[PDB]
Ligand binder design. Structure first.
Ligand SMILES: Nc1nc2[nH]cc(Cc3ccc(C(=O)Nc4ccccc4CC(=O)O)cc3)c2c(=O)[nH]1
Ligand SMILES: Nc1nc2[nH]cc(Cc3ccc(C(=O)Nc4ccccc4CC(=O)O)cc3)c2c(=O)[nH]1
Ligand SMILES: O=c1ccn([C@H]2C[C@H](O)[C@@H](COP(=O)(O)O)O2)c(=O)[nH]1
Ligand SMILES: O=c1ccn([C@H]2C[C@H](O)[C@@H](COP(=O)(O)O)O2)c(=O)[nH]1
Lengths: 284, 284
């Protein structure tokens, strides 16, 4: 339910502590939160504020492809990673000789080629590294009671090579009574900008994997480490905090897909999405 | 407070689902829980049941040394890893040519040498891999507002070489108002046997790091993925569930220590620990 996210926002606004951060902004921060969102006959796309669903779908397909090039996602119309891959930002991190748009070894590279030696974004890493995503799919297919169905994106060796280290760093899957659930550990949660996006992203991943493995989507457990509200997000969120939540939409997959790499953007349809208008919240 | 662990126990006994596991036993399972334990002027060593504190301290010192040899921990009187390091078990996982007691690349090897090529338990891995523990200590010392203070033991590349994959796979640290807090993500939680041990283990790690960096211990947030109670632990836990909890003890560090490697077992003293008698809960 969306009241969990709204309650987390209210709790950070009422009990969070003022804390500096890597960017010039400030935050109201709280350490350690957990919410639960049902995936049964509904999709947790927030209704108190319109969420960039096209960005969610395109960025998840971009993760599944193992791509770390921000230009490949920007060509689809999703510019969420163009800022963290811009020339000025890479220069601000010392990567002066790094090609523009190369985010380094990030979510997709760790999902599909964990442990492989990262060269650049144009390299072909076929057959290299550890393919975590296909491993969790096969584990769900052959041993659903396994307690190690984990995809981890935190790689300390590749950490100083990343433009932005993973925020949703680890996720675990769980199967019971033909229901597939997913828990996400998010080390850093931009409650206004990034967190609803990550909620929808991992709910979509759970739907995809449940479609492939013949299971029904269960719950999505969102665990947060440093859940923070930026200052330029205080007044916007309060606006969102005074809107009546509407029922969640539904996600329908239009064709039967066997492999996760064969999913395309046209295979997904959002039904009954009636959100309140968007609320601009600038990135840090 | 200890009532959080007891509440998780009660919630698993009343709402858990029957689930098979890797072992021959069964479990009452729940996916996704989170508890908060205060470290302010108290140490969360459970009082409704005596916890093997000597094992906690010696195992944390064994992790900090980067050791993967179970015999080095057994020589101190802690035989918790002898079962997963026995000849029959190593043979049950295919490691026929592996010396007995060699757990493979596990918690200590990932804490101190992430990414290094694992040879055996007798090898000297100085300078190899990524030293995550010292990196998080330096980060706490120089940049406490950092949101990337993470120590991760989940290595998919070294995963098929481990006798037992990490259960407490990832932890994150957080600093505010000169208070150091720690969150742990445990993918698999043996609620009867292992979870009380891991609570004290990570509380002690937080105390050590707070002592080194000159901070005060704050909270320990225990997040659980698959939190399960084994069947042969149902009736024992009920006994523990009807005991009146006593106040938590205190942890005192007897001398000023500069580096984490310089800690010794004689440096720590538990004060005021008056637990109820132990309750036998056999390992699976
Ligand atoms: N500080 C910081 N850096 C980040 N780097 C990467 C991220 C993740 C992320 C996730 C989602 C979006 C997003 O929905 N954008 C968008 C696009 C079109 C229209 C409206 C919006 C939202 C709005 O501006 O109202 C952007 C970024 C991120 C972050 O959240 N915070
Ligand atoms: N199923 C399963 N396998 C495991 N492998 C590793 C762990 C972690 C862990 C953590 C703590 C202890 C512990 O206090 N033990 C203890 C206490 C008193 C007397 C004898 C023993 C040892 C024993 O009874 O065997 C043992 C194990 C673990 C687990 O918890 N469950
Ligand atoms: O999927 C994502 C990507 C980014 N962020 C936000 C969290 C932080 O506000 C910022 C990352 O900054 P560091 O915490 O690494 O300093 O991006 C998210 O919430 N979700
Ligand atoms: O520190 C530890 C180590 C092990 N376990 C338990 C969790 C599981 O019940 C068992 C390992 O089996 P798998 O979950 O990996 O199948 O050990 C813990 O709770 N804590």
């Amino acid at each position: 339910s969306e009241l969990q996210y709204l309650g987390q926002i209210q709790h950070i606004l009422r009990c969070g502590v003022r804390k500096d951060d890597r960017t010039g902004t400030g935050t109201l921060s709280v350490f350690g939160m957990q919410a639960r969102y049902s995936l049964r006959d509904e999709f947790p796309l927030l209704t108190t504020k319109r969420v960039f669903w096209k960005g969610v779908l395109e960025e998840l397909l971009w993760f599944i492809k193992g791509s770390t090039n921000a230009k490949e996602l920007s060509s689809k119309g999703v510019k969420i990673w163009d800022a963290n891959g811009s020339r000025d930002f890479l220069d601000s991190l010392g990567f002066s000789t790094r090609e523009e748009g190369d985010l380094g070894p990030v979510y997709g590279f760790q999902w599909r080629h964990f442990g492989a030696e990262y060269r650049d974004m144009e390299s072909d890493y076929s057959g290299q590294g550890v393919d975590q995503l296909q491993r969790v799919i096969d584990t769900i297919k052959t041993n659903p009671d396994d307690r190690r169905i984990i995809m981890c994106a935190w790689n300390p060796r590749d950490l100083p090579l990343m433009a932005l280290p993973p925020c949703h760093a680890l996720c675990q899957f769980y199967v019971v009574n033909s229901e597939l659930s997913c828990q996400l550990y998010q080390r850093s949660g931009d409650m206004g900008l990034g967190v609803p996006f990550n909620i929808a992203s991992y709910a979509l991943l759970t739907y995809m994997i449940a479609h492939i493995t013949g299971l029904k989507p269960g719950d999505f457990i969102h665990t947060l480490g440093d859940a923070h509200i930026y200052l330029n997000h205080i007044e916007p969120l309060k606006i969102q905090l005074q809107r009546e939540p509407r029922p969640f939409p539904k996600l329908r997959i239009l064709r039967k897909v066997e492999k996760i790499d064969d999913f395309k953007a046209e295979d997904f349809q959002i039904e009954g999405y009636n959100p309140h208008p968007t609320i601009k919240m600038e990135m840090a």
